[PDB]
Amino acid sequence: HKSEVAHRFKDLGEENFKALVLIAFAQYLQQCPFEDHVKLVNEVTEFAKTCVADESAENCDKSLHTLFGDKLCTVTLREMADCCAKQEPNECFLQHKDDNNLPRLVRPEVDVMCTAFHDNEETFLKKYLYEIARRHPYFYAPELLFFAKRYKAAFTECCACLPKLDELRDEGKASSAKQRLKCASLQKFGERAFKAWAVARLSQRFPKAEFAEVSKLVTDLTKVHTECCHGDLLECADDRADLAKYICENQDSISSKLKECCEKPLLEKSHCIAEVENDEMPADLPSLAADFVESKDVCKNYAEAKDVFLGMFLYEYARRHPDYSVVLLLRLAKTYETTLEKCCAAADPHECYAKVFDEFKPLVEEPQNLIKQNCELFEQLGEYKFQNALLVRYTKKVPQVSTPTLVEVSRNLGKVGSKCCKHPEAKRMPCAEDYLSVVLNQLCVLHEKTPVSDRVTKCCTESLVNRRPCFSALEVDETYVPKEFNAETFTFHADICTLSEKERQIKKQTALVELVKHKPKATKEQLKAVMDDFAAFVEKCCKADDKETCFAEEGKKLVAASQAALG
């Protein structure tokens, strides 16, 4: 292949290429009219055809980053321009992309959306690709190409009914956040840490497959994601399409779960394999200890390849423990490597290695007992009240943080409780990991935008594996000077009784926060006393004949009394 464009145009096909090219342009030039991107893509497409016709024809030879880089530089940047002088021969384009600056899409009315989708369809779907990508610049291209199929699907069936369009948006926000964490994680920690992550992931999903079949996959999976983060982005679709292709053909040596997935069309099959259920873990496995802890050959075995040995130890743990989080497994592997290094240059190394599971135990039980305490508490209190018990926890821990932010975390976190304590004990830690990683991802991106505590920052850029623990490590802040009393923020009105449940809660939580900030001393029993007295205050005044006089009057009686319980 001399002509890359034509190597891609041939493999991907025209529809995929155009979408992929549009995504790349959209991801780079975010604030930039749809009609621009459309124009550029049409100029590339037409040029790709002339390279399918003739590899010999000029500039077919030039690299895509040049070719695409060339067209971005076509098109004045008053609205990042300096990279454009020359297509970089990108690292300027990336890190020059904000994760956070465009009006939130406001949906056109459903009859109008339906008319247009019927009237053009091709433009309407293209605009989707266009809008999500500018808003979300680290989304995997292959999944996107599919979300759009799941758009075109909704409209064709719906046009009663599009709550489903709202769900698609919620999934996109997630499959966005995760790709950015993955890309960042590879860039900060290297390709090694990612390869390890992937091992853990796939050996849980496929405990039957051989360590050589996993390893092969991890190399291909790491290639794809290394490209999609580099952003050339046609290769990934090409190379991911070759993974699915491969896995489909080798189901029998991988998973008994892939049958239903590997019948589905090219775009859908790839999504299904990644969501596919873990296989039944095999029978007649020896104990983990016998190769890794019991053997008197560890050091020699570790020495011949350090990396394969570690990779095997991780694969074995993972097949054994689907329940364990991918991050816990990685921490355990790190501990093993650390042990082997101190132990191997030692007299009696086997005696030093032998007591190594004594170290894994604390790491396994930290998250498990953590999950339990919080699932118990969720199960007695329920979503809202649990949210409230979290608002007190975390504002006691980091009071310096801004209230609207506190009330956004704690509500999301309590929503995690209701999405993971639903599941049987088995699946909690994987599910928790999944949801928490987005929330610590967005939280730490914001703290750098507007930093307020040093301790949070340390947790926000220690090892990825360290951070959920580091935040769990955070204790109650005992230097915090109580914020000043302020009457308007502890004053309520008639409106709260009319407002919707959603609105109401946030209002009542926002108060809770500000209460803790003003009285961070008070014990949870004192603070149960107040939220009880508040509950009573709200329901009384909601039944009262003159709401407002009741709110006004009882408000002063309440506050008078509650400050009287400072002491």
Epitope: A212, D284, P286, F292, E294, V298
Partner: nanobody
């Protein structure tokens, strides 16, 4: 491809010894759970001995416990089977297998050898 190759097999006096070797070729050849299976004349395959990737775990059929040992070099890429106190019973084609588990099931091994023959009689 992941090739297996066997050798060491022949004729041997009852009471004597033989050491089979299987050399392994292909990616990640060292990693796999590996097994010896024998096929006595006019019968099916049956597991003689099994060995984990680093030789820290070994199963044996009862037929041969106390007489046979199973070992792997790994660097060499060669799997062994040290046969002692041979009995005419043990006269079977011997076969090498590679898989993902320490199980004694023919179906659960992906890769097989061509098989070396062992005869035991005076």
């Amino acid at each position: 491809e992941v090739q297996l190759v066997e050798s060491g097999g022949g004729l041997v006096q009852p009471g004597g010894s033989l050491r089979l070797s299987c050399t392994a070729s292909g990616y990640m050849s060292s990693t796999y759970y590996m097994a010896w299976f024998r096929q006595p004349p006019g019968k099916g395959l049956e597991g003689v001995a099994l060995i984990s990737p680093y030789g820290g775990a070994t199963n044996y059929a009862d037929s041969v416990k106390g007489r046979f040992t199973i070992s792997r070099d790994n660097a060499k890429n060669t799997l062994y089977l040290q046969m002692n106190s041979l009995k005419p019973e043990d006269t079977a084609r011997y076969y090498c297998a590679a898989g993902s588990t320490l199980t004694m099931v023919v179906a659960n091994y992906r890769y097989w050898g061509q098989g070396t023959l062992v005869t035991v009689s005076s």
